[PDB]
Amino acid sequence: HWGYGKHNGPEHWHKDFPIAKGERQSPVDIDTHTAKYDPSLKPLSVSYDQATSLRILNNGHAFNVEFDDSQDKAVLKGGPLDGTYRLIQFHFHWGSLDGQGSEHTVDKKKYAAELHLVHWNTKYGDFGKAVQQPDGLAVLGIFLKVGSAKPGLQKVVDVLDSIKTKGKSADFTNFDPRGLLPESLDYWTYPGSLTTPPLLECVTWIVLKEPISVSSEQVLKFRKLNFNGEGEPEELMVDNWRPAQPLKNRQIKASFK
Numbered sequence: 001h002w003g004y005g006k007h008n009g010p011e012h013w014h015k016d017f018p019i020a021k022g023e024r025q026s027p028v029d030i031d032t033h034t035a036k037y038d039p040s041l042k043p044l045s046v047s048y049d050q051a052t053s054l055r056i057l058n059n060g061h062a063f064n065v066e067f068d069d070s071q072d073k074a075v076l077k078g079g080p081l082d083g084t085y086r087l088i089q090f091h092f093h094w095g096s097l098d099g100q101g102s103e104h105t106v107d108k109k110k111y112a113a114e115l116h117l118v119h120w121n122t123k124y125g126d127f128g129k130a131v132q133q134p135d136g137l138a139v140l141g142i143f144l145k146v147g148s149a150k151p152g153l154q155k156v157v158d159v160l161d162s163i164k165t166k167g168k169s170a171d172f173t174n175f176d177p178r179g180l181l182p183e184s185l186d187y188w189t190y191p192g193s194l195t196t197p198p199l200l201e202c203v204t205w206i207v208l209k210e211p212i213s214v215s216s217e218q219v220l221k222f223r224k225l226n227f228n229g230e231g232e233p234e235e236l237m238v239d240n241w242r243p244a245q246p247l248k249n250r251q252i253k254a255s256f257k
């Protein structure tokens with residue numbers, strides 16, 4: 001089954017998931033000089049005050065911090081979005097080295113990592129139904145660079161020992177996702193897909209311009225995770241990112257002048 005290695009990685013995905021070569025695949029390169037300021041964009045609203053995290057899971061490709069989405073708690077609205085999208089989970093993509101790891105790129109620049117906060121549209125009642133709709137999902141993409149530590153990330157960093165291998169999970173209640181945001185909410189937005197199989201072209205991407213900084217020791221701990229399950233040969237969880245995909249004359253719009 002799909003992974004990130006030579007034999008099961010991004011170049012192989014299209015065989016099981018034909019949509020890998022579809023018309024709105026993610027991620028993409030954000031060419032800053034081609035993106036246009038869109039004044040019809042309403043202000044973005046990230047409301048994570050009442051967020052209810054439940055647990056953290058190593059799924060053999062990344063780790064997901066999962067949220068209780070059975071009520072309108074953590075929500076994304078405004079910006080390019082109509083209506084209300086509920087936070088369901090977040091996860092990261094990172095590299096083996098600082099000079100790679102992000103999925104989206106900016107003028108071809110790769111960040112050390114990329115955080116994806118995944119939200120589903122509430123007109124569709126649940127996640128599984130949302131992912132059958134062209135406007136079912138909204139993903140908030142935040143770049144990570146290596147610099148000073150991100151305090152709001154350390155509770156995640158502390159728990160990764162508990163979930164080293166594929167299939168392991170740990171209690172992860174009372175996590176506040178607001179600690180992972182940068183100061184500015186300036187963003188690029190384009191219509192796209194999930195970046196892991198089954199891919200699925202149901203995402204409104206909202207990619208933040210301002211990266212967060214995380215410490216070298218924080219990202220180092222991401223890199224100690226395993227792709228394999230307990231009692232198997234060690235396959236370090238690194239370079240779990242899909243590279244940039246053809247834009248196919250979609251338009252990337254900027255929230256900012």
Ligand SMILES: CN1/C(=C\CC2=C(NCCCCCCNC(=O)CCc3ccc(S(N)(=O)=O)cc3)/C(=C\C=C3\N(C)c4ccccc4C3(C)C)CCC2)C(C)(C)c2ccccc21
Binds near residue numbers: 019196200
């Ligand atoms: C292609 N296509 C369509 C379906 C395709 C399709 C399937 N249909 C169901 C897709 C369900 C996906 C679930 C969510 N996936 C995530 O990854 C979310 C996490 C995540 C979030 C964000 C990020 S990130 N990186 O932040 O972005 C990264 C990860 C497949 C399997 C379905 C199963 N089912 C139902 C059951 C049930 C029980 C057991 C086993 C299964 C399997 C798994 C077999 C596999 C082959 C492709 C449809 C919708 C018909 C469609 C319409 C129009 C055009 C095309 C098209």
Ligand SMILES: [Hg+2]
Binds near residue numbers: 136
């Ligand atoms: Hg879709």
Ligand SMILES: [Zn+2]
Binds near residue numbers: 091093116
């Ligand atoms: Zn992702």
